[PDB]
Structure 1
Amino acid sequence: DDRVLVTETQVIRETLWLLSGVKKLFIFQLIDGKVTVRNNIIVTHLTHSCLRSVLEQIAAY
Structure 2
Amino acid sequence: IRETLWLLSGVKKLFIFQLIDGKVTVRNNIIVTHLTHSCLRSVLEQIAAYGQVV
Fold similarity call, TM over 0.5? yes
Percent of paired sites with the same residue: 100
Q: Give 1:41 deviation, angstroms.
A: 0.9
For structure 2, list consecutive stretches of 5 or more residues without a partner in the other structure. Answer: none
Q: Normalising to structure 2: TM-score of the pair?
A: 0.81
Q: Give 1:44 deviation, angstroms.
A: 1.9
Once residues 24 and 36 of structure 2 are traced to their aligned partners in structure 1, the CA distance between those partners, rounded to angstroms, is: 22
1:8-35 per-position Cα deviation (integer Å, ceiling 9, x unaligned): xxxx000000111110110110121111
Please tell me whether Structure 1 or Structure 2 has the larger radius of gyration of its CA atoms. Answer: 1
1:34-61 per-position Cα deviation (integer Å, ceiling 9, x unaligned): 1111101111232211000111111111
For structure 1, list consecutive stretches of 5 or more residues without a partner in the other structure. Answer: 1-11
SS in 2 for 1:24: coil
